[model samples]
Target: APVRSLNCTLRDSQQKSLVMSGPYELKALHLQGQDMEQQVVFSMSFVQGEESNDKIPVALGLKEKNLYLSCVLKDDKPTLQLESVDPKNYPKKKMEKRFVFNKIEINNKLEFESAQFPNWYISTSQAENMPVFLGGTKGGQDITDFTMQFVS
Candidate 1:
C-alpha cells in the first residue's frame, strides 16, 4: 500500500551486498573496499493477497534508477532484472509475468519467491561473488536463502 526506501544488504554466507551491474543484471558483490560504491536503496511495496497469507508479497524498485525489480524469463531461465515498467500496465504488457514476490522467512533468513514461480527463488552463489539468479530446491538447488542486513 505504501513504499519504503531503505538502504539494504542481501548477502549469502560469504557476505555480499546485492548490486546493480550493467544493463539487464543484478549481482551479489562483496565490496568492503568500496562500501558506498553500490549500496542500493530499495523502494519496496507490500501487497497483501486475497487469502492474506503470512507470506508477504511485494513489488520492488531500485530507488536511484526508478525502475522496477522484476523476476522474469530470460534465456528460458528465471532472471532477476530491473525494468522500466508501469505497475498499472505490467500485466497487459508483452511479458505475461508478475512484478510480485512472496517473502518467506526461513530461520530469520529471507527467501524471495515469486508468485509465478513458487518453487523457484531468488538465489545467491556459493562462490565469493556472482550474479543473483533464480534457482529451485527441487541447480542442483545451489543456494536459495538470503540474509538481509536491513534498516532505513
Candidate 2:
C-alpha cells in the first residue's frame, strides 16, 4: 500500500492559482507575481482503500485549512464542496466514493473527474471569484487542465 501526499500549487486552466474566495467557493484568480510563495498551495493525498485499484482517488484540500474538496450534486448539477472528510473512517458506501476523484493525466496536464459523477469534471469559472463547478465535456475549462507546481 502506498500513501502519497502531494503539495503543490494548481494553476487554473489559464495562468491562475485555484483559491477559495467566498464561504466555500473556489476560483482561479490571477496572481500579481510568479513567485511560488505568492500563490496558495494545496494538499492532495492518495486515498488508500477499496477502489484504490487502477484509479488514483485523491483528497484535495487547502493547505491552510482542514477543509477538503468534495464533489456534490445540487439540482442535478455536479457541484464543488469544501467539507471536512474523515479519511480515518471507512464506511463502505458513505465515505468510499463521495469525495473521491479519479486523477487523469492528459496532454501533460491533469483533470479531476468525479468518481460519483462519471463525466462531470471539476472546473472553475472564467470569471474571477466565481465558485468552482462541474461541467460536461465542453461546459467548462477547455478540459479543466491544471498544471501543478509541486513544492519539495
Candidate 3:
C-alpha cells in the first residue's frame, strides 16, 4: 500500500508543546494494504536537511539512560510501553517492536488512548519532567489529557 504521511505535535497537560530540534515525519505503514482496517504500523523518522534520516526506534529519556518509550502490542492491544534497556547497544528488534500508538481519536485534537488500560489516556505530567504514561481522569481534568495538533 502507498505510505501515508502526517505531522503531529504533542502538547502536555501543562500546555507546553513537545518540541524537537526540527519537524519529524509520522508515517503510517499499511502492511496489508491501504485499508485502515488492515494491520497498520506507525513510525517516526527524523529529517535532516534534504538528506540523512534517522528512524526513532527508541525515544530516550531526558536525563536517564534506562528510561525510554516504545510501541508494543500487549495482550492483542496496541499500546506504548515504557521500558529500560542498555543505552549503548540493545536489540533493534526490541526497539522496533515498541514505538507507535494505534488508538487514535481525531477530533479538533488527537487523543491517544491505551488499549490495555481502558479509559487511561497517554499524557504528560507537570508534576514530573513531562514523563509520558497511561493515567488520567475521564473528565479531561487529569494530567494524562493531551491534544495532538497536526502542524503539517
Candidate 4:
C-alpha cells in the first residue's frame, strides 16, 4: 500500500477547523538501513496557491520500522526533531522516554495533547507564518488552531 497524502487537521478539543489562508504541502521520504530496516522523514511548507520553494522538516521516528511523527517542545514551543537510530543498537525504551506526547488520536482529524501541559492543545498560528504552539482552551475559544488538508 502507498500513502499519497495525509488528510487531517490540527484542531482543538472541541474539534473546530482552524482554517489557513493558503494550502500546504508535505514531502516525505523513506530510507532503508543496511539491516533492511526502514525509517521515514517528513517536511512541510505552504503551497502558495502554486509552488513553494521553502520546505520545513518535520521529525518522524520509527517504531518497529514503521513511521511515526515525533516532536518536542523547544523553549515551550512545539518543534520537530527526528531521531535516527540504528536498529541493531537502538533501544526502544530510551526512545519512548524522549517523546513528549504518546497518544495520537486520528479519526476525522488528528489530535494530540501535551504530556507536559495537560490542558493545552497544539495549534498553529493563523498568521502568514505558520508557527505551532501549545494553546490554552478558555471558554471554548482558541485562536491558535489549524486545520490540515492534503493538497495535490
Candidate with top TM-score is 2
Off by over 4 Å in 2: 34-38, 49-55, 86-95, 138-143
TM-score of each: 0.75, 0.77, 0.40, 0.34
Cα lDDT of model 2 by residue, 1-152, tens digit: 34456787787667667665567766677776554345667777777434533446676767746677777777877777888755454212233566777777767778888877888777766676565667666353343767778876
Please report the TM-score between candidate 3 and the true structure. Answer: 0.40
Candidate-wise lDDT, in order = 0.64, 0.67, 0.39, 0.35
Give the per-residue lDDT digits (tens) of candidate 4, residues 1-152: 22122333233333333322222222122213452122112222111121122221222233243333345567876544444556564333233433334233344444334444444545544333343445554124434323343322
Model 3, position 108: C-alpha lDDT score = 43
Ranking by lDDT: 2, 1, 3, 4
Q: Which candidate, 1 or 3, would have the higher lDDT against the true structure?
A: 1
lDDT of 1 at 33: 74
When 2 and 3 are scored with lDDT, the better candidate is 2
Spell out the clash pairs found in candidate 3. 70-98, 70-99, 71-98, 71-99
Off by over 4 Å in 4: 1-98, 102-107, 138-152
Per-residue accuracy of model 3 over 31-78 as CA lDDT, tens digit each = 222442321122222211111122121222323234444545568654
Error of 4 at 55 (Å): 30
Q: Is candidate 1 or candidate 4 better by TM-score?
A: 1
Candidate 1 structure quality by residue, lDDT tens digits, 39-127:
55665555544224446776666655557767777888777777786646432212324567777775776777877777777777766
